[PDB]
Amino acid sequence: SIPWNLERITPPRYRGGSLVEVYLLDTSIQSDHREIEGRVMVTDFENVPEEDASKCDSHGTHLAGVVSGRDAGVAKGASMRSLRVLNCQGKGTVSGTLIGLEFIRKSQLVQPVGPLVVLLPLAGGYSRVLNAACQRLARAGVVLVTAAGNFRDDACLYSPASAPEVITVGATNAQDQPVTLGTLGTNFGRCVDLFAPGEDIIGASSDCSTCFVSQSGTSQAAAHVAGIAAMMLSAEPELTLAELRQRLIHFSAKDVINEAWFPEDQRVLTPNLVAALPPSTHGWQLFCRTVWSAHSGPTRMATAIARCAPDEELLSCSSFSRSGKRRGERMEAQGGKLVCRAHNAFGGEGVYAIARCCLLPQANCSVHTAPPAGTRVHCHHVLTGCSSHWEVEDLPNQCVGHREASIHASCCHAPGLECKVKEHGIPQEQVTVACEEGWTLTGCSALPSHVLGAYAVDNTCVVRSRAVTAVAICCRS
Amino acid sequence: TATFHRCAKDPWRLPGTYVVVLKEETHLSQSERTARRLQAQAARRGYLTKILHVFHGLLPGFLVKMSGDLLELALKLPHVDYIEEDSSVFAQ
């Protein structure tokens, strides 16, 4: 009887939302429907372009029901407030969406409540002003959840999907596969944070006050994550956006999507996560995430930068290129805070910087660099990452690099952190080594025959090559 | 140094309406003054305009209905950071 999507997000061990409010920007809604009656408040804010009745409020009713419906909702308690920014044909404007986001902020200033979650079940093309407004509303302290987009495309070309500091959510089906319908389907790429059930989701139907329908979209998928976020913030009201995003990642089912569905270049950039509620078991724990930069472009002096959240520490830095035309990476300070910067080679099409960003309170971290000598440095407390960069065109707590290269070591003073180094080499397009259960991958690098790059995939270190050896640094309390 | 931007997906564009975005620290009193300035310099040239909304709270700025002809003029107003042409968003 339990709908598949609700079972899918139930943790392997288990036992909300009332202190949290969830704003919805959608079509009008049938707020008398028994799934949501007494739970959604229509603001009657409205800003929609003109058209070019049970169909006018179908989309929004279903989503209100997915977040909060009493039979089929994710966070069955939660209060919702609803703004109308989509017309009867499902269309709206950037301008109107801007004024909605401004309206939610003005209401909060006028009558403050608790944590606020804003669901944005819409997209258009990349928009500078819409992305800036989301970023700004995020820095004021509001959590934004956004659809990845439905065009089987790189999500970074759409808004608010690509916006910084928004949680962007793609859709999977009952087989944990990316939704695909012809040349349509869930967007993907490095601007997607995670996936959630988004195919055949039963929810409130505006056909009658007690009816139910199955809809599919990335909106349905973002609605599961908004509801999960609301219950997470009801239990730990004080979470920062870094701390909430690190938990959504940690409690996701992992390596369950079949990456074959994605175009080849996007498998490395797309997180293999399907969202899930946190269990009953939850003690401090070391959370880390991997952050891929924008591609650097092909200018000869190009660099890509990868940054962490202000309350995260950069514990390691690596880089990747599809051609292997690459001059490595290095950690550099910036506004008093370390970032991860990768360098293109002359003639390469560009590189990615790949940061490992962790929540490590009480941590004093530094960088130890040795210019070319082979080359070595060490932490004279715990080594969390090794990086290396060179300026030539071609060839213990200790990092070791090529003789012609600079070698950089990330050293952190963390009382209560235990760390260990695990190795694995073989004769091979890809070589792999993983941290033991209960440890966190903090750094991933290849030993110095020609490598494309290295990246942390969850707790596995992946090295990509054209005796190649992968090196993982793993830490716990 | 002010720049202009519009949707790369040509069917999703909505020409004739523009979000004028002003520099971060600009105050609501300045935003409203820059709008009336735009309207006045446009009318001097024979263009009707319509200020649909004045943003303050997240981004300062305003929403104007006007012909695209004025974009080189509007780009030169004080406090302007950049200007973006309105476009469509869709239920996902």
């Binding site: 809809q215 979209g217 | 239920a91």
Partner: peptide, 9 residues
């Protein structure tokens, strides 16, 4: 898949 969701029939 319903037409209320863009870009489905």
């Amino acid at each position: 898949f319903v037409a209320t969701t863009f870009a489905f029939x």
